[PDB]
Every structure is written in C-alpha cells, then in structure tokens.
Amino acid sequence: KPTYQVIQPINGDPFIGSLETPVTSSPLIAWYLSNLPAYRTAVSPLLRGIEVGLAHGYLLVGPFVKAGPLRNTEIAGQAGSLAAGGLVVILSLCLTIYGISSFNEGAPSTAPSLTLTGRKKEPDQLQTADGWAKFTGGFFFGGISGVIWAYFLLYVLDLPY
Amino acid sequence: DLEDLGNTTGQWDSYGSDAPSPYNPLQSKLFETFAAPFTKRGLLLKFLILGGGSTLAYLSATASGDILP
Amino acid sequence: LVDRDPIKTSFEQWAKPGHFSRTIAKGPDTTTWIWNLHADAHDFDSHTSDLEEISRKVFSAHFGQLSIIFLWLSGMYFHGARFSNYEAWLNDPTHIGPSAQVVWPIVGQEILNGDVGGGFRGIQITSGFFQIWRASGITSELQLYCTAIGALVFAGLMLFAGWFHYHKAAPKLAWFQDVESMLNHHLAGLLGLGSLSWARHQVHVSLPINQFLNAGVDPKEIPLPHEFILNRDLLAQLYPSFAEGATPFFTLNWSKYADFLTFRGGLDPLTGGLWLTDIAHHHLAIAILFLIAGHMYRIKDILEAHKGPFTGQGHKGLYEILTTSWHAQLSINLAMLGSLTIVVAQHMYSMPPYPYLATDYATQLSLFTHHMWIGGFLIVGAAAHAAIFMVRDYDPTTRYNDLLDRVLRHRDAIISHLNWVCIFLGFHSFGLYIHNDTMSALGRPQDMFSDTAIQLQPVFAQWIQNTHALAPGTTAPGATASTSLTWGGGDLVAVGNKVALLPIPLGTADFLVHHIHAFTIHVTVLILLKGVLFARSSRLIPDKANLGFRFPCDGPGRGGTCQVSAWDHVFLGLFWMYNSISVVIFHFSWKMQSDVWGTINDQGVVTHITAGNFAQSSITINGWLRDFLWAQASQVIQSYGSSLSAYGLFFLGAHFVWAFSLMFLFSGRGYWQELIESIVWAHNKLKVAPATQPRALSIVQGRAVGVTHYLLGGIATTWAFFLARIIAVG
Amino acid sequence: MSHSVKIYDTCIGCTQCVRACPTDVLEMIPWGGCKAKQIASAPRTEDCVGCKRCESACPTDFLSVRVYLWHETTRSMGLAY
Amino acid sequence: ELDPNTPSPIFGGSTGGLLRKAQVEEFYVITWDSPKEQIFEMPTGGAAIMREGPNLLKLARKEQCLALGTRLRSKYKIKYQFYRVFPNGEVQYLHPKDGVYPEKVNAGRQGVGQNFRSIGKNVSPIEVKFTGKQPYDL
Amino acid sequence: DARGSKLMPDKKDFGYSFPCDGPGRGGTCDISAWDDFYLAVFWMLNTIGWVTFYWHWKHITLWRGNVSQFNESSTYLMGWLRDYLWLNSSQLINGITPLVCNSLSVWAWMFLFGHLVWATGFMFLISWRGYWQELIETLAWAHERTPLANLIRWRDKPVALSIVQARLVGLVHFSVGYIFTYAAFLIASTSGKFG
Ligand code: CLA
Numbered sequence A: 001k002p003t004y005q006v007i008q009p010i011n012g013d014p015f016i017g018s019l020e021t022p023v024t025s026s027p028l029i030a031w032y033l034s035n036l037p038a039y040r041t042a043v044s045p046l047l048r049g050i051e052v053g054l055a056h057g058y059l060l061v062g063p064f065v066k067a068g069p070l071r072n073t074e075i076a077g078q079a080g081s082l083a084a085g086g087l088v089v090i091l092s093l094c095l096t097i098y099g100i101s102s103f104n105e106g107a108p109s110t111a112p113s114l115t116l117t118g119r120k121k122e123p124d125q126l127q128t129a130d131g132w133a134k135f136t137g138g139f140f141f142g143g144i145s146g147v148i149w150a151y152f153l154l155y156v157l158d159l160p161y
Numbered sequence B: 001d002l003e004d005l006g007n008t009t010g011q012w013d014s015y016g017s018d019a020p021s022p023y024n025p026l027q028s029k030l031f032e033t034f035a036a037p038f039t040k041r042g043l044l045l046k047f048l049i050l051g052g053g054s055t056l057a058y059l060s061a062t063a064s065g066d067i068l069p
Numbered sequence C: 001l002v003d004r005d006p007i008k009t010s011f012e013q014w015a016k017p018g019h020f021s022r023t024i025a026k027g028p029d030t031t032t033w034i035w036n037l038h039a040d041a042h043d044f045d046s047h048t049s050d051l052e053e054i055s056r057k058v059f060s061a062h063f064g065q066l067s068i069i070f071l072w073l074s075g076m077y078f079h080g081a082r083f084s085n086y087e088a089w090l091n092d093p094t095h096i097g098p099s100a101q102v103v104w105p106i107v108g109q110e111i112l113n114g115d116v117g118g119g120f121r122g123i124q125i126t127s128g129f130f131q132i133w134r135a136s137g138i139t140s141e142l143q144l145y146c147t148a149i150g151a152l153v154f155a156g157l158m159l160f161a162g163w164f165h166y167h168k169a170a171p172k173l174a175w176f177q178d179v180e181s182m183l184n185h186h187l188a189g190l191l192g193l194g195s196l197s198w199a200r201h202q203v204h205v206s207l208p209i210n211q212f213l214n215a216g217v218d219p220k221e222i223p224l225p226h227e228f229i230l231n232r233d234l235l236a237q238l239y240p241s242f243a244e245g246a247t248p249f250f251t252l253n254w255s256k257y258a259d260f261l262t263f264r265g266g267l268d269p270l271t272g273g274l275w276l277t278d279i280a281h282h283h284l285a286i287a288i289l290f291l292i293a294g295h296m297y298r299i300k301d302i303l304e305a306h307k308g309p310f311t312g313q314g315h316k317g318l319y320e321i322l323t324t325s326w327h328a329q330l331s332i333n334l335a336m337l338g339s340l341t342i343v344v345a346q347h348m349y350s351m352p353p354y355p356y357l358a359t360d361y362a363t364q365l366s367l368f369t370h371h372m373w374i375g376g377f378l379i380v381g382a383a384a385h386a387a388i389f390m391v392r393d394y395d396p397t398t399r400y401n402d403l404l405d406r407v408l409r410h411r412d413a414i415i416s417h418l419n420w421v422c423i424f425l426g427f428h429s430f431g432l433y434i435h436n437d438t439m440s441a442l443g444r445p446q447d448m449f450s451d452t453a454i455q456l457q458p459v460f461a462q463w464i465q466n467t468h469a470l471a472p473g474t475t476a477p478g479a480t481a482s483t484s485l486t487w488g489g490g491d492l493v494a495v496g497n498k499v500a501l502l503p504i505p506l507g508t509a510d511f512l513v514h515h516i517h518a519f520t521i522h523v524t525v526l527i528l529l530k531g532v533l534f535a536r537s538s539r540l541i542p543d544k545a546n547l548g549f550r551f552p553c554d555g556p557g558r559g560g561t562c563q564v565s566a567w568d569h570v571f572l573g574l575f576w577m578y579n580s581i582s583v584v585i586f587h588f589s590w591k592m593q594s595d596v597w598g599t600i601n602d603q604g605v606v607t608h609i610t611a612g613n614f615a616q617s618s619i620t621i622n623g624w625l626r627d628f629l630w631a632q633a634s635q636v637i638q639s640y641g642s643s644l645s646a647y648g649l650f651f652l653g654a655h656f657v658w659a660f661s662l663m664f665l666f667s668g669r670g671y672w673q674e675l676i677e678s679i680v681w682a683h684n685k686l687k688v689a690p691a692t693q694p695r696a697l698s699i700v701q702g703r704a705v706g707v708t709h710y711l712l713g714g715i716a717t718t719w720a721f722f723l724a725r726i727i728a729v730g
Numbered sequence D: 001m002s003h004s005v006k007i008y009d010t011c012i013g014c015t016q017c018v019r020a021c022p023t024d025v026l027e028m029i030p031w032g033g034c035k036a037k038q039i040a041s042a043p044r045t046e047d048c049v050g051c052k053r054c055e056s057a058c059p060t061d062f063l064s065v066r067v068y069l070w071h072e073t074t075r076s077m078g079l080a081y
Numbered sequence E: 001e002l003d004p005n006t007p008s009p010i011f012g013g014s015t016g017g018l019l020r021k022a023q024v025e026e027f028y029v030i031t032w033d034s035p036k037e038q039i040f041e042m043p044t045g046g047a048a049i050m051r052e053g054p055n056l057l058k059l060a061r062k063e064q065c066l067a068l069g070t071r072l073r074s075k076y077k078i079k080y081q082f083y084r085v086f087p088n089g090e091v092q093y094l095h096p097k098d099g100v101y102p103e104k105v106n107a108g109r110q111g112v113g114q115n116f117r118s119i120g121k122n123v124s125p126i127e128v129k130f131t132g133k134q135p136y137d138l
Numbered sequence F: 001d002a003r004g005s006k007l008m009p010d011k012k013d014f015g016y017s018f019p020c021d022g023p024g025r026g027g028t029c030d031i032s033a034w035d036d037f038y039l040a041v042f043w044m045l046n047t048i049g050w051v052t053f054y055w056h057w058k059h060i061t062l063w064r065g066n067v068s069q070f071n072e073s074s075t076y077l078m079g080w081l082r083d084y085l086w087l088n089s090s091q092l093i094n095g096i097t098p099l100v101c102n103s104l105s106v107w108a109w110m111f112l113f114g115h116l117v118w119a120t121g122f123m124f125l126i127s128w129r130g131y132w133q134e135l136i137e138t139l140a141w142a143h144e145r146t147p148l149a150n151l152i153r154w155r156d157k158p159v160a161l162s163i164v165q166a167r168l169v170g171l172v173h174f175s176v177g178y179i180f181t182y183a184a185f186l187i188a189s190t191s192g193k194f195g
C-alpha cells in the first residue's frame, strides 16, 4: 500500500544513499537477476561461466561479420567465427589476470547446500581464486563455442525490411 | 467498518523472499571436467597464452597466395 | 563610514582612502584593488547586508542601457541617413553592395573605402538596416534623420528616469516584492501593444509603399510623406474600406474578397522576402494573445498544486524566494533570452522576414552568427548566475526541503549520467570522422562512411522535412508551398541575380555534424550543470562555500583542489561553448554555399558557390581544411591593398591576441611576482618604483585575462575570415 | 613530512589570528611564555589533508605552507573511495 | 535497517554519503546536543530536521563532521562530538581524548616545531646524502 | 632562485619540482624552478621554430628559385602565412583528397595527428586537477552503485592527476603534436616541391 513500500530510501538508513527507487529495486526488476550472480551466488560459479560465456558468445557476430572490416563476406569462414573467436581469447584473459586480484585460496566445495545460506556476509569477496578460475574457465568454453552456433546457423535472417 | 478487504490479503504477507524460485537448469556436471584445461589449471595459463596466440597470430598471417592488402 | 554619517553631510565624499570590505583598502597602498572594483563593482555581498536598495539600483542601470541602445542607432540611423548609400541602393537594390560608413583619408586609411555604391566609396556593411529599412516607405535621408533624433529624444529622458530613480529619493520593497501583476501588463500591452501597434504602421503605410515599389520608380515618384489617413483612396488598392462588413463578425458577403492578410507561405519573386502580407496578419494574430493573456491574474496558487511521487513537494513554494532572489531570476531568463535568440538564427536563414535577404548572402549570416554567439554567450551566463544563486543570496536556510533539496539529494547522479552520455558521443560523435582519415588515407572507400559507401543509399528524403512541405493534407489550408522554402518538396524558382533558397536536402554528412553538435552541446552543460549543482558543498570540500563562488582554488592538498569552485566551471564552460558556437557557424556557411547559395543562369542551372564539394569531403575532417580553412581563407590572405583589407589586416592581430591568451591561460602566478621584483629592484636603484605596491595578477584575474582574450582573439579571427568570403564572389 | 609545511611564526597567539583547518591542528601547547605564549608549528598531523588554509590567516613570516608531504595517504588524499 | 533502528538524525535518502570503503576501512560518525527541533544544512547537499538524541549521524570522512562544526556553531550550542569507527572497534579515538576545543592547555602531545634547526638561513642546502649514521630521520 | 625569494624565502629541500603552493600570500603558483623550466620550454619551442621556419622559405624558394620572394615576403607577417605556410601545404593536404589517395598519405594524417596531439595538450594546461578529481568522485559512485559492475575492485583508487604531472603531460603532448607537425609539414612539402 505504502506510497512506495513502507517508504524507505535504501534498505533502511538514509545515509548511504542510492536513493533506492525503481530500477534500483522493484519487485519486477529485482527478480530478473538471481541464478546469476546478482544477489546470492547461485551455484559455485563453474556453470554460470558458460551461460555467461555462451550468451555473450554468439553475440559479436553481425558486429564483426556484418560490420566487418571489408564487410558483407563471401568466405566460408564468416558469418563467422573468424576474428571474433579471437576476441573471446583476448577477452578471456584479459579476464584471467584479474583473478589475481583475489586469490584467497581454498577448496571448501559448496554448490551443495546446508542451511539457508545468508552467505552470511557475501557482500564483498569471499570468492577465492579457486572459483574465479572455474568461471573464466567456463568463459573460454562459452566464448569460443558460443561463437559457432552463431555461424553454424544458416542465417534465415531478416532483411532490413 | 465492514469493507476493509479485511487484511487484504496479505500475501504471507509481503514476504517474498523465503522461496521465490527453484534455482537452476538441471545441467549438473554435464560439463564437469568436461573440458579440463581451465578445469585443471594449477598451474597454467602461459602455456595457453603462447598457444592460442601463436596460432591466432601465426596463421592469422602468413599466405597462402596473398589476397593482398 | 562616517565620512560623515547620516544627518549633516550633504557634503559629498571625494577623498580619504576608499572603500571596501572593512579592513578597507588599507590606507597603505596596493595595485590589486584597482583591478578589484571594476570586477565585482556590483557583486552584492557588499554595499548592504539588506537587499533594501539594490533592486532600487538595478532598475536604474537598466535605464542606462535602454538609453545607450538609443544613443546607439540614433547613431546607427544617422550614419544610415546622411552617408546615404540607401537612397541610392533602393531604386537600385541587387546592384548596390551597401555602406553607411566612411573613414576620412588620413595616413594609410582609405585603402579601406572601396566603391560600394550608387557611386560612392564606402565600407560595406553587414547588419541590415537597408532591410529593416525597406519597410519605411516614404523615404529620404533627412528623416531617418528624424527617426534618428526621435532616438536621442528617447534617451536623455529614458535616461533621466534613472536620475528619476536611485539618485532621487526613491522607492521601496513592496513594489517589486509585491510582483503580483508584472507580466500582467508587460505581455498584455507592449508585447501586445507593440506587434499590435506595429500592425498599425505595417499595412497602414508600409505594405502599400512597397506594394508598388516591387516594380521600380524613383521613390516619391511614389510616396508622399503624410498622405496616409482619413484619406484613403490608396488602401482601395491593396483592398477595400470593408465596404460593408461591421467590426468583422458575420453577416458578411464575399463573392470576391477576404481582408488584407491572405496568408503567404512562400517567397516574393523579384523581392524574395516572403510576403509582406502575412506580416500584418501574423503580428495581429500575436498581440491578441498578450492582449488576451496578460490578463492573468493577481500566485503560489498554480505552482502550489500538482505534486507527484517522484515529483516535487518543493514544486510548492518553489520559492517564496523567487520574488526575491534576483540573481536567480536573471539566471532563469538568460537560458531563455539566450536560448530564445539562437532560435532566431534559424527561422531567419530558412525563412527571411526582410525584403532582399539571401540574395544578400553576407548581410544575413553575419547575422546568423552574431545572433548565435548571444544564444550562447548568454546561456553559459544563465548558469554562472544560478551558481551565484546556489551559493549566496538569501540571508538564511529557509528555502527548505524541496524539489531542489530534492535534485541535490541526487547530484553525484544527474551528473553521473550525462557523463557517459558524452563519451558515448565523442566516440560515436568524432572518432567517427577519424575513421575516414585513417581509412581513406589507408584508402579503401568500400568501407568509409561516405554518403555513398556505407549504406543508407541515395535518399535522405523522408523524415519530417518531406512531411513538412507537402504541408496541406491538412486542417492546413494554405499558400502554395511551405512554411520554409528549403523543405524538400517544391519549387525551382527563387530570385534574380542569384539563387536565394532551395531544398538543402541533407543525407549523411548532415547526419554526423548534427551529431557532433549533440556531443558538443552535451559536454558543454556537463561542466556547467555539475558546476552550479556542486556550488556550495562537495565531496572534496564541505567547507567549500565559505568565501566564494570565485576562490582561486582551495589549496594544493586533496591531490588537486584547484579548479573546483564554479566561476571556473563558468570558465571551462565558456572554453567549450566557444567551440559549440564556433563549429555551428563552421557548419552553416560550408553548407549554405556548398549547397543553396547559388546562381541562376539560363535554364536555371544552379551553380553553387561551390559545386557541392561537401558531398564526400566534409566527412574527412581534413576536407574541413582542404575544402574549408585552406580553400576559403584564400580570400583572407589575398585581401591586401583593397577596401575590405581591414579584415586580412585584423586576421593577423586577434589571430595574435588569441595566441597571447595561452600566456595568461597557461602560467603560474608567484612567477610574474618572482619576476615583478627583479623589475622592482632595478626600479629602486634609480629611485623610481615602490609607492602603490605593484603586484601580479589575482590568480583568478589571470584566468579572467585568459578566456576573455582567447575568445576576442579566436572569434574575430573568423569575423575576419568570414567578411572576406561573401563580399567578393558569394 | 609526512606532513611538513612550516607555518610557524613567533607570536603563535591565536585570537583574531587563525583556527581554520579540518582537525589537523591542536595548538595551545604553550612554550614558557611568548606574550600570548601558545606556540609551535603543530599538534600531531597524521590525520588530515593538505590546505594552506593553514596560514591564509595568522602569520608564518618566512614560508606560506602548502601541498607538501609527498608521502601520501589515502585519508590524507580525500579519495580512496 | 529495521530490526534495529537506533536512529537519532533525520534525512530521508541521498546519493551523497558513504559508499563501500567505509566498511573496509575507517568509519567516522559525529554526535551532538540539541534544544528544540531545527532544520539543517548538511554535508552532501541538503537537509533535514534534528530533535534529539543520541543525535548520532555518521559520516564518510573527518573533514565532513568538523565541516559542520563550523556548520554547527553558527546556530550554536556547545557539544559536538566526532568519533572514528572501524570495522572492528578501536584505536585512533578522535574527539574524545583530553578536553576539547583546541585553544586550551592541559598538555603538549605534539608538534615541536623546527625539526633540527630554525627558519633562519636555509639558504643552506640539504646536506649529507642520506646515510644511516646522522640524525635526519625526524 | 630555485633557492627562492620573498614570495617564497623558503623554497627549498625539494627545490625543484614542488609545483604549486597554497592561495593567499599574494596568490602563489608555478614558482618552482621546474615550472619555470616548464614555462621555459614553450620559448625553446618558439625560437627553435622561428629559426627553423626561417631556413626553408629560403632554400625552398632558393631551389626552383626565385630568391626574390622571401626578399619581399620575409618583410611582413601576413604572407608569412599566405605564402609559405599557405603556399606549400599545397600538396600534402590532399593525399586524402576526395577523389582518391595520392602519394603521401602518412604525412598529412600525421600533420592532423599533429594538430590533435597539440590541441589536446590544452586540457592539461587549462584544467588543473580540482575539476577532474571531483567529477571522478561522482563517477566513482557509478559502479560502486550500479549492477554487474560491482564487488569488483580496482587495485588502484581512481584519481585525477597531480598538480605538477599535468603541467608536464600538456607539454610532452604540446610538444609531439607541434614537433610531429613540422616533421610532417616540411617533408610533406619539400618533396613534391616546387621549391
Ligand atoms: C542579464 C545579465 C547580466 C547582468 C546584469 C550581469 C551582472 C553581473 N554579473 Mg554577470 N554574466 C552574464 C550576464 C550578466 N551579468 C553573462 C552572460 C555571463 C557569462 C559570460 C556572466 C558571467 C559572470 C561572471 C563570471 C561574474 C559575473 C558577475 C556579475 C556581477 C558583477 C558585475 C561586474 O562587476 O561587471 C564586470 C565587468 C567588467 C569588470 C568589465 C570587463 C569586461 C571585459 C572582459 C571586456 C569584454 C571584452 C570586450 C570585447 C572588450 C571591449 C573592446 C576592447 C577590445 C576595446 C553582476 C551582478 C561576477 C560576480 O562576482 O557576481 C557578483 C562574476 O564575475 N557575471
């Protein structure tokens, strides 16, 4: 009922701010994002890696196969993996040497669940390095790979119009 | 005071959190190793860096016939 | 102070050493204060704590300006009468190339003054009276010499009303701080009773006295001087004595008429101003509104009303203050006055409102760039003065908790966005061009962005322009063509040397300039917005409003702590706008001549001052000095020994003054001190210095002498560059 | 040094003279008289940023003061954050 | 944060105030006396009404509390406290410590002032080029 | 007086690059012996320009040469632009020229690379760390606040460049542009010729 929730700016204290509002926090947005890392960690990553790798994968095709350097290609290759498959490699390790910001190094192991987590204090890290690996390892097999059922597909395609 | 949609209605109520979705698509370990080389790593990643980048660059240029600049 | 207070000196103070801030100018001597005081001659922290007068001063300063325009332009209208050019031109227009102004021949001077004319040596003019002017029908040189003194009348009097305030014992609070009427009046009967009154002297007299001028004669072969009342036979032509209507209304019959009016749309042929006859109707149809409109009303009433959930409580009593801020009710205004001047700058060039413009090229682009720098020089201001609000004006807090207090609530936010906006632009809004170079210099056009190469394919044509002319599907009735001739549909046919006005169709290469404008308009505003918003307190300084909107910079710490403030956001925001406008100008003339400005020739084969070089070649940003700066400008650096020459001969100075600014812009301050003493030493040996402690420039004065010079430098450079490539071919 | 900009003077009296500065300065130590006899250049300075608001007012009668630590904190920066 | 509201001091929301590295370093909350409820300026673009107490709002960085302080003694009162919080409680305890109101004596603390030598003629350059035998490290 | 003066008596033990000092006293600034060196390098980039400028125009004209031309056209300032500077860019400016690309393209693109590197000096030079740092204070409320951008830690905290640094960088920027423009200018014109 309350003019917008029991009317609060933030979670409650005003003072951090973020002026929590729609597009910050509406039952409708907020939800379109929790198997995914925004709030909770669904599973120990390893898997999120490829839905991340892959979805972002078959992107970067018409960007560099329809806007390519000398464009609209007559080659077997593009439509194409090509260079883009090269980008997921540069990308994916530009990605790794960031997982040298956190190492923090363990196996604990839980994608299995005890007791509704809370994480407890997930906010902030508590991702060890042996986590950020299995993500940016999922990234490679998500990038390269997610680059082929892009071109594998014939483009049945829609014409400008 | 009849009307009021007497506690109307609530939800339980206007909580949400406690089970909004079953979590994830099955795929369990349809990958698990499956491809190891980032699933193995300690230690790697040079190894790979010279490899990927050696092909990309190596065949990336040389030959067959020109097609020149 | 006390030379001698209150009651008991008429006797004026000239002398004993004089004034400001309480450890007042010391006694003991300095230089800076002579620079202080021209600056910040009015700020209004000082003179009185209590607004009291000042509103009682700013009415007087206003009077002075109104006079002054008047002193001006009597001058102008003089000049315009008795150094005539005008009588001669008007029989003669489209031959003439017109002056008001002549040198005297002393020393060099007189290269300058080169035959303009109906047979006299001149300096050619590009502000047009001679076009405001066409309107007077009656004519002759000695009058304008009456309109002239009529000017000096309004002045002396509209300048003894300024005696007749402040200095005279004079007024008090209520009179402004009860507003309740003020727009009521203003818009009703002046906004109205001018445009209204202007109607009455815009068909009465002007219409007829160019209705049969648009043929020739030697004037007065046409128009008697008073001629135009109880009389009128002459109205009969140009229409009826209403013959039998009554006070409009209807039980009226036309089998053939409808009152003067009769709307025009398009341009006159053989005077392509646009019809001198929609000019009455439109002004008439204005005034009414104003006539009805300035009849609101007394206030919070409307403002205190509607509220929303995002929307602002503040909206209400959105300002008891407003009546007495001032600095705020000027800042708002400048944005409008200012932003309502450069909307002139379009409707002008794509819809001339004076007889003989377009054909007259140079005498309405000067315009479109003068009017253009005000619809900009007055906008950055319109921020400065808000910053002047945002810091100081009210004694105390009691604005409270609104809409503003709202906007600020977010503030590392409204400006958090706007930022990315710009780097999205810039990358899509300039490196775009740089592609071309890097790849047309690499050279493979297949893949440029050329209007031909990257595919839209050869139409601009349909967006609005094509719906706009094409106009009468409509509830629209009217008038054979357009509101503006340029819009795509319609016509070959406009004018007699020359082309005046034609579609202008754009495509791409109108597409992306149009976008650089975006990014230029946007990062301008970022700095002013974030500037005026973070006015008083910041995440870097809290203790930030405490002297100043000015202070130099807080101090070497916090890392930088230099620019900050908001004099300086209104210092680096000018710096941009100088581009904002400086590149919009660069846009219009390269278009308006590459296409449009014309010639007609047998069978009308159009010959644009440049056969559309624009085509494939503005897109390259070198083409912008291949086709612009190095192409045109060849007329600036050829201009010696001539008549205009004063442009080529300026174009070096002021193309010097600019390259003097950097010295003021780029340098320290205890430097010219450290230097100023070596000096001061040599000075003392001969016994020639100390008294009035010679001092270096006041950190921010130094910035004041940047900027200001960087502009009157970098600007008149083109004022020269221009008048030198429309005078002479074009 | 790690904050070393000398504002010292000789009176170190602080009435209609100088106070301004975010935390840094507790002074009022005395030294065995100087007229007003509150002395020194400083209190312990590992707390706040780098103003020269430090003179601007009340004499230093040699150097002004200024930026100079070099050796620079974050808290001493303003930004980390 | 509902389950405990301790609050004394009254904004509503803002974009302003502390973002993450107040948790990961050093915390900085200021507290105060009040009479009868008044409407205030802030740090961070503005403003609120107070009432009473603890009257213990927390700020980002120390410049900000003191900054009111100027703020807080025009419109007056004696009493303003500012403390520094970690994550993990104490050391560095900021306004508490002896007296307050600098411009008093009990003690010295601090400061010196001179280093080794006084203001007069360092026309004299720096000297020996850093060796760990001679008193150049304070 | 790197050792220093009145406005600074002290100015020492960092003699060189201590750039800036607090406002007050008279107002004190680029008054380190570095920032006079900093200031110096503009006139070493103005002499070493008048001088070099000179040879070439002379030489140029000397080679299919009228000499005459320098002789009447050394004399005055305008038409130091007009011919030289305005004559004889001629060729280079189109290597691009819309109807396709002619022999020199490196040079003219360098010559505009020349006008950018230069111009973009000015920021550094009319900007002064204060304005930059502050909006980076708002612009580092983004991520910290905005999703899918978050947790995610810099190892180095965002900042705006110190208060000596940018007097350099605008310069070491002013210079390349400038020195990379004449580089590309003379060559891009003593190569076609006419001389
Ligand atoms: C309708 C509004 C108009 C009015 C009435 C005012 C009024 C005021 N402005 Mg203001 N301002 C305006 C428009 C206006 N402004 C605009 C459009 C801008 C943007 C540029 C500004 C930017 C601005 C700033 C930054 C400041 C003010 C300040 C002020 C206050 C100080 C006035 C003063 O001492 O004169 C100042 C005039 C001089 C000292 C004369 C010097 C003029 C030089 C620069 C010459 C200009 C170049 C010209 C080509 C030279 C003549 C030709 C020559 C070569 C022969 C005053 C209340 C000042 C303040 O502190 O607020 C209290 C503050 O300085 N204004």
Ligand code: CLA
Binding pocket: C418, C419, C420, C422, C423, C424, C425, C426, C427, C430, C431, C434, C519, C523, C524, C526, C527, C572, C573, C575, F116, F119, F120, F121, F122, F123, F126, F127
């Ligand atoms: C030619 C100029 C140079 C450049 C490139 C810039 C660029 C910028 N200025 Mg700026 N400025 C300059 C000179 C320059 N300025 C000068 C001389 C002054 C004063 C004399 C200022 C005063 C000023 C102010 C007050 C402000 C700016 C702001 C900005 C930013 C606006 C946002 C934007 O669109 O940036 C991005 C786009 C560009 C920089 C242009 C495109 C660059 C091309 C060449 C692409 C290169 C990218 C490519 C991937 C290179 C990688 C290759 C590899 C070999 C390295 C932008 C960074 C404002 C800001 O930060 O707002 C966001 C702020 O308002 N400037």
Ligand SMILES: CC1=C(/C=C/C(C)=C/C=C/C(C)=C/C=C/C=C(C)/C=C/C=C(C)/C=C/C2=C(C)CCCC2(C)C)C(C)(C)CCC1
Binding pocket: C069, C189, C190, C191, C193, C194, C195, C197, C198
């Ligand atoms: C009581 C009476 C009355 C009254 C009378 C009068 C007194 C009137 C008037 C009239 C009027 C009162 C008019 C007015 C008009 C105005 C106008 C018309 C305006 C103007 C202006 C201008 C022209 C300007 C311009 C400009 C611009 C645009 C901006 C800036 C620049 C310049 C300035 C150029 C009557 C009649 C009923 C009668 C009975 C009695």
Ligand SMILES: CC1=C(/C=C/C(C)=C/C=C\C(C)=C\C=C\C=C(C)/C=C/C=C(C)/C=C/C2=C(C)CCCC2(C)C)C(C)(C)CCC1
Binding pocket: C652, C653, C654, C656, C657, C712, C715, C716, C717, C719
């Ligand atoms: C030896 C000597 C000398 C010297 C001289 C010289 C060497 C000079 C120069 C000069 C230069 C080398 C430059 C300058 C320039 C100036 C100027 C330039 C001024 C002014 C201006 C104006 C008037 C303007 C106006 C305008 C406007 C209106 C706005 C914008 C545009 C323009 C700019 C157009 C003398 C004799 C003095 C003194 C004695 C000694």
Ligand SMILES: CC1=C(/C=C/C(C)=C\C=C/C(C)=C/C=C/C=C(C)/C=C/C=C(C)/C=C/C2=C(C)CCCC2(C)C)C(C)(C)CCC1
Binding pocket: C147, C148, C150, C151, C154, C193, C196, C197, C198, C200
């Ligand atoms: C521009 C110019 C000028 C001129 C001036 C004059 C001399 C004038 C004018 C103008 C005017 C002066 C106008 C007037 C007009 C008027 C009017 C527009 C009126 C209105 C209406 C009426 C008349 C009334 C009506 C009524 C009715 C409806 C019925 C009964 C009641 C009453 C009466 C209300 C001057 C010198 C400054 C110089 C510069 C240029």
Ligand SMILES: CCCCCCCCCCCCO[C@H]1O[C@H](CO)[C@@H](O[C@H]2O[C@H](CO)[C@@H](O)[C@H](O)[C@H]2O)[C@H](O)[C@H]1O
Binding pocket: C491, C492, C493, C603, C604, C605, C606
């Ligand atoms: C500039 C690149 C061309 C691309 C646009 C071309 C499409 C439209 C055709 C030409 C446009 C110019 O329009 C022009 O047409 C004719 C030139 O042949 C001229 O035709 C005019 O001259 C003659 C005199 O009686 C007659 O043929 C026409 O009745 C008359 O309109 C006109 O001066 C002008 O109306």
Ligand SMILES: CC1=C(C/C=C(\C)CCC[C@H](C)CCC[C@@H](C)CCCC(C)C)C(=O)c2ccccc2C1=O
Binding pocket: C663, C664, C665, C666, C667, C668, C669, C672, C695, C696, C697, C698, C699, C701, C702, C703
């Ligand atoms: C060059 C320069 C100076 C030096 C400029 C000075 C000292 C200009 C002041 C010179 C005045 C205008 C000379 C006045 C003397 C005459 C008016 C007196 C005789 C009167 C006549 C009849 C000649 C600064 O002070 C400065 C300050 C801050 C940032 C940058 C700079 C900067 O770049």
Ligand SMILES: CC1=C(C/C=C(\C)CCC[C@H](C)CCC[C@@H](C)CCCC(C)C)C(=O)c2ccccc2C1=O
Binding pocket: F123, F124, F125, F127, F128, F129, F130, F132, F133, F159, F160, F161, F162, F163, F166, F167
């Ligand atoms: C833009 C700008 C900033 C902001 C700082 C910025 C924008 C740094 C931005 C990083 C750029 C994008 C890096 C690109 C440079 C590359 C050539 C990489 C450098 C490689 C080296 C190790 C040499 C300041 O801090 C500043 C301070 C004082 C005066 C003027 C200014 C100023 O103009």
Ligand code: SF4
Binding pocket: C552, C553, C554, C555, C556, C560, C561, C562, C563, F020, F021, F022, F023, F028, F029, F128, F163
């Ligand atoms: S000039 Fe002064 S205020 Fe400006 S940056 Fe330097 S030290 Fe700071």
Ligand code: SF4
Binding pocket: D007, D008, D009, D010, D011, D012, D013, D014, D017, D018, D040, D041, D054, D055, D057, D058, D059, D060
């Ligand atoms: S500022 Fe100087 S004079 Fe004033 S108290 Fe401090 S040391 Fe003494």
Ligand code: SF4
Binding pocket: C557, D003, D020, D021, D022, D023, D024, D025, D048, D049, D050, D051, D052, D053, D054, D055
């Ligand atoms: S500005 Fe200077 S004097 Fe003031 S607290 Fe900071 S370091 Fe100390």
